[PDB]
Design a protein around this ligand. Structure first.
Ligand SMILES: Nc1ncnc2c1ncn2[C@@H]1O[C@H](COP(=O)(O)OP(=O)(O)O)[C@@H](O)[C@H]1O
Ligand SMILES: Nc1ncnc2c1ncn2[C@@H]1O[C@H](COP(=O)(O)OP(=O)(O)O)[C@@H](O)[C@H]1O
Ligand SMILES: [Mg+2]
Ligand SMILES: [Mg+2]
Ligand SMILES: [Mg+2]
Ligand SMILES: [Mg+2]
Ligand SMILES: [Mg+2]
Ligand SMILES: [Mg+2]
Ligand SMILES: [Zn+2]
Ligand SMILES: [Zn+2]
Lengths: 748, 15, 753, 14
């Protein structure tokens, strides 16, 4: 018996039209014949028992032509006496014929509770499945019910799924947030461990609580908030997705392709019952997954040479910030992602100030103190425009993640002796003075600033892990200790010789884009170090001399917001443009001295980076009262004054720096720019080293550039450039002593 | 030779 | 003897020396203190204060215990336990910040269920069961029954005519009620209607009717609502009813805590919100219901009537052009994007984000009254669109055009007065002063309309001045008083009798803006744009090109190169006429290919840089995405023009090398930093040319975004309207022609775009 | 002046 698609409502509008009105699509048929024949295409008539009721009005030959034309256009379908009128309309609406669906749902399923899921809950899901024509065997699909996605029993299920090639679905229907999915398809989707790697990083407080717990000698039960309605909502919701998967699976095993409606394969759906929000989270299959992939990928890549190539430019990056955001948006997810969120912190009405918050990163905390020290350090976006600030925030968040030690990084155990000339002593990079090391504990105990932490002396007699790094200058591999190359590398309590920092770390759309930025960050910090700790008087910059209105407009904005803004030149022996933005509050309780830095071959971009960093740090803080200030730079912001720090304001003894004071040395190619920088460094006696931190499951390129000898802008007073460069440039006639270096640490 | 009744038959998706 | 407990949604983890962690699914907390580690394990719900004091009679004394609990209580960690609630249910409510004994009391409030349309009685019974399982009792409603905290209405469609009656009783009875549609492939959930606070069902219906143009057109043709709820699994039904049960519970609890203590509850509920859960695909959308101030049912439908006859408050709007950023504009009006409760269907970028030179959006179109399948597809086309030098600008452009087009539509509450041309006398403006159709055009209108290739060249019937008609007050900025135009000219789709259809409301001069003066300025510039195009196009004038390398704008040059790289040439023509306000035409042809795809775009502004920018981004908007479509699959108006017409057929499209290139200095600077000063500059420039400038404020209070139609009688549309006036006269006044053209010598090719 | 264990009491959202 013949019928038009059961999900269509039929309304005849007589002379030439009949409309097919659906909930998600509407169609229109034109022709008087349609008006005559369609009313009898409701399922209540045969090709036989039709002609008997309209012959003498429409020939059998005309009917066939119409009942053929509706076929190869897709309006005709068969019935299935097995399905209700309602169910059949559901599958036809997805573009699946009723009888096939009935055949698909015939396929059985298995349910497996894990964790604390009761059998009454299992029985409820069974009932939900019955009701839609799906039986449970006591398979094509295994359904696992959990109270938490990090339940250790899932690791075993996952390994068995992989060896058995069993496709399975995860669901958490208890708690105030429903988790639904993914459907794992071995050799196609990621595995549970691909997911678990993300979850473990995104559960920082839970992770540290467990550490704190174990130290006192897999997950904790937080799924406590459940209504019988939210439970039923999740089970019933899952039954629908189970049916959709089975039906899609049944048809594609036959006509692969051809069925395109979305399923939970490679996706996790979260439905927050408390606040009412539904989000879709994409699971990335990690090629370096130790369970379903090859964990040796980063090891192998690290010991092979670095291959750079031409990168034409199209503000000297090779792609738009809109595009970078677009292809890496999927990383934004507290569940499957690496970036917790990406929020515009500043007022959209303001066209000059754009700062984003990109919140979440993780570590290693074993105490409440360190746990709130983590969680406090947020990734932030910086920009002249909203789009650039967005990309900045997103990419920094992925930058910080990629630098975190996972345990698969390229490494080999050795002493400094048995590596010889290839190995770089950590002291060449850290540059702490002998006096600082000697008075470690006393000095560290006296804090105003945590990042000034003095590590234990490196003990060359100890075997350590060394990471291979590519030298762009000498075109061969060198070695840094792994502890310097990545964040949160675990060291023995009695050989804590380093804490991996972020200086020279950078993300980019390509490797050479990232390397260029990383290098410039090093010149920036080195420039600040020379200026800050020698307390040099520097010339200001005439911001009107650059063909960039933004600078002086921003100055005017600061002016209207109780502030002065000025920029100092920090350009040193490498000759690369580098600057410090400085601003003080004119009224209020405190001066709130704030600083921002930038360096770039293009001085306009360098200044722009500096001034937008001032926006990033200081302006949101002017919002919050002195008493409410919990920022790391609190004491500085409240108590310190411009009068007691003359090296902050411009030297009126020197002329204003202008655009013409900065020679152009950038090209049309980012690769060339990188090779220009490395040679500049080489002429200054410095070696440029790169470690590629790019993670395959992330994609966005991340590196750490290291130039041993170049100074960090933290309080590190070992011999070297900090003392010598200012004299080489004539800024000082004789070097300062260690005891003459700025006793006030750079607080940002 | 096709009847005009059969020819004027059109089908379209409004959306 | 009440039981004390740390709120049960927290898992308590004591880390023995000085720490205890409160781990929750949606928030985590840490308490520091010897005493906390000591006392917390006794706050699990099994203990009264009395019991804890003796349980700890060893070390901690009573007054210390008291101080600890006060602190926990004041910071919101401690609460009374509700014996009648399971730990899991109490946890759900404590996580929403509700004390479990308060939640338990709120849940005792009875509710009523009411089916409408074809909702079954077992469906009603299932929801009843769902509610009962979470502690909520159900009663049956009656026509004059005592009030309840919530009436839940289950429908198969949100435009079921019976909802109008329910809505009327609810407003008079001050009854709060909920709508839900648990049948069909898309669950609709909400809103909760609160009479006096939220919008009414009529507020919603007014949006729904509009966003269902297929349904509406079928209904018009047929001569209410129709179904479409066929597709239902028993799992999707139950998903919808259980979901509804949760939101019902959350509403009644919220309502209980705000009866006393207003504003102490934060968590979202379905008040003024609709949730759609598409079951077939997977997607969840929240749709904001705006309470319409001019609602015929719950509001004052005579606002716009009153406002129309009030004078126009214009004031200084400093530019920081336009008064705000496009990102602010978008944010403030994002909520208007919704195919259910909104006025714009969608807002999507169509162009490649990797391209930093081209930014076009399509904003989903609204509706017209169409009585035919012909009418549908036409009023289903003409999507609103955005264009920009940047992504944010194009986004704002698309959104604001969509709201602009909606705000111009005749709803039936617009300022009107029934009168003849005579009774109003000189305040009245004859419609022919605006239309400017020729006498010949009117006489032969029926044949000409039948032979016309282009729809917008429709010649209306003549205006019978003897007929009483509806005139709409318009503000004259030149004379600072009210004039009158026929309502049929001031708004879209104003219905006229078939024997007296003397006008169709057009879009010329219509504009939106963050302020009135912003919208007026843009509207005015649109008028000079079309006038300029009309002069050039229909006189087929040869115009000089523009040296785009003389404006200090790198974008023009970059775009030309981008065109060169994508099989096109791009140039600009000067259309600046007697008003001296710079106006331009961007023109571009394909090199190679089957057809030349002649495309063009226009723009006018006080700032010639912006004018060229408008023109050239419009050619981007119209053409670039059309190029990749082959001639066969080309749709839309102008297809004939695109495939057939060549540059050799229209030499007035390319610049005449007889004249020098227009440079930046050829355009005197006449714009300020005040938008208001700029419009008063425009009103006076027009007045100098002997032209009056009128304004009709089309701003709808439920929309917010200002929308106007600016009308300057005499200025030409770029449509084929060949009545006497500027079309013939301006070119000779400027020395562009030695003699006027006759009507018969006007360009026989209608301007395609 | 407040006793140490009373004074050390603190709470915070993480
Ligand atoms: N448009 C972009 N494309 C790719 N990466 C970017 C982009 N903008 C910024 N980043 C990256 O994001 C991080 C933050 O950038 P930025 O805020 O400019 O510098 P920093 O935070 O070092 O002062 C850097 O690693 C940078 O390389
Ligand atoms: N940034 C903005 N803020 C408010 N309204 C805008 C903005 N940009 C464009 N619009 C409005 O959106 C509509 C479309 O703008 P545009 O595409 O620039 O002009 P047109 O479509 O008339 O050529 C116009 O009514 C305009 O006033
Ligand atoms: Mg940063
Ligand atoms: Mg950085
Ligand atoms: Mg920085
Ligand atoms: Mg437009
Ligand atoms: Mg317009
Ligand atoms: Mg336009
Ligand atoms: Zn895996
Ligand atoms: Zn209303």
């Amino acid at each position: 018996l013949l019928q038009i698609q059961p999900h269509f409502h039929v309304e005849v509008i007589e002379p030439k039209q009949v409309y097919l009105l659906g909930e998600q699509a509407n169609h229109a048929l034109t022709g008087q014949l349609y008006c005559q024949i369609l009313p009898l295409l409701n399922g209540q008539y045969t090709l036989e028992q039709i002609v008997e009721k309209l012959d003498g009005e429409v020939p059998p030959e005309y009917i066939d032509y119409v009942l053929e034309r509706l076929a190869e256009k897709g309006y005709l379908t068969e019935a299935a006496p097995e399905l209700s009128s309602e169910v059949a309309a559901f599958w036809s609406e997805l573009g699946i014929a009723p009888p096939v669906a009935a055949e698909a749902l015939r396929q059985p399923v298995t349910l497996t509770p894990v964790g604390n899921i009761s059998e009454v809950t299992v029985a409820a899901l069974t009932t939900a499945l019955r009701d839609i024509g799906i039986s449970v065997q006591t398979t094509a699909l295994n359904v696992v019910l959990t109270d938490d996605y990090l339940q250790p029993e899932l690791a075993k299920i996952n390994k068995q799924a992989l060896e058995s090639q069993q496709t399975w679905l995860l669901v958490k229907p208890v708690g105030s947030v429903l988790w639904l999915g993914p459907v794992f398809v071995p050799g196609k989707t990621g595995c549970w461990d691909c997911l678990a790697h993300r979850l473990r990083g995104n559960r920082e407080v839970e992770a540290s609580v467990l550490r704190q717990k174990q130290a006192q000698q897999g997950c904790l039960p937080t799924a406590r908030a459940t209504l019988p309605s939210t439970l039923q909502t999740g089970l019933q919701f899952a039954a629908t997705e189970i049916a959709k998967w089975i039906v899609k699976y049944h048809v594609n095993a036959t006509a692969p392709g051809t069925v395109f409606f979305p399923t939970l394969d490679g996706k996790i759906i979260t439905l927050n019952h408390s606040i009412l929000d539904l989000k879709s989270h994409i699971l990335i299959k990690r090629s370096q997954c130790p369970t379903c992939g090859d964990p040796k990928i980063l090891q192998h890549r690290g010991f092979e040479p670095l291959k750079l190539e031409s990168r034409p430019k199209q503000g000297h990056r090779g792609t738009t910030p809109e595009q970078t955001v677009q292809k890496y948006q999927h990383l934004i997810s507290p569940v499957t992602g690496v970036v917790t969120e990406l929020v515009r912190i500043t007022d959209p009405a303001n066209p000059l100030v754009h700062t984003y918050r990109a919140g979440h990163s993780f570590g290693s905390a074993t105490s409440l103190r360190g746990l709130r020290n983590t969680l406090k350090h947020k990734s932030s976006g910086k920009g002249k425009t909203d789009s650039q600030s967005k990309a900045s925030g997103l990419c920094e968040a992925v930058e910080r993640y990629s630098g975190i030690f996972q345990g698969d990084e390229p490494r080999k155990r050795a002493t400094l002796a048995e590596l010889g000339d290839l190995a770089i002593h950590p002291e060449q990079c850290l540059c702490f003075s002998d006096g600082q090391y000697a008075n470690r504990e006393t000095l560290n105990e006296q804090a105003t600033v945590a990042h000034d932490w003095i590590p234990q002396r490196f003990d060359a007699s100890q075997a350590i892990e060394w990471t291979p790094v590519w030298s762009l200058t000498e075109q061969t591999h060198k070695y840094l200790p792994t502890a310097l190359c990545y964040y949160h590398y675990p060291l023995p309590p009695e050989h804590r010789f380093a804490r991996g920092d972020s200086n020279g770390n950078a993300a980019g759309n390509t490797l050479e884009e990232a390397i260029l930025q990383g290098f410039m960050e090093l010149v920036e910090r080195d420039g600040v170090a020379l200026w800050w700790y020698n307390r040099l008087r520097r010339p200001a910059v005439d911001l009107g001399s650059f063909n960039e209105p933004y600078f002086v407009q921003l100055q005017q904005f600061y002016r209207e917001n109780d502030r002065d803004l000025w920029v100092l030149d920090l350009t040193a022996d490498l000759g690369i443009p580098a600057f410090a933005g400085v601003s003080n509050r004119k009224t209020g309780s405190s001066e709130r001295l704030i600083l921002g830095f930038g360096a770039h071959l293009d001085p306009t971009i360098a200044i722009l980076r500096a001034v937008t960093e001032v926006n990033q740090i200081g302006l949101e803080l002017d919002k919050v009262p002195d008493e409410n200030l919990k920022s790391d730079a609190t004491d500085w912001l409240i108590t310190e004054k411009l009068a007691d720090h003359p090296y902050l304001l411009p030297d009126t003894t020197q002329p204003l720096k202008t655009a013409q004071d900065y020679p152009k040395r950038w090209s049309d190619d980012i690769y060339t720019d990188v090779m220009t920088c490395v040679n500049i460094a080489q002429q200054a006696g410095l070696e440029t080293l790169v470690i590629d931190q790019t993670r395959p499951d992330i994609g966005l390129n991340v590196v750490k550039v290291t130039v041993p000898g170049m100074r960090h802008f933290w309080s590190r007073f070992g011999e070297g450039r900090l003392y010598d460069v200012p004299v080489k440039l004539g800024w000082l006639d004789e070097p300062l002593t260690e005891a003459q270096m700025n006793p006030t640490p750079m607080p940002f | 030779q096709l009847s005009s009744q059969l020819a004027e038959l059109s089908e379209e998706a409004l959306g």
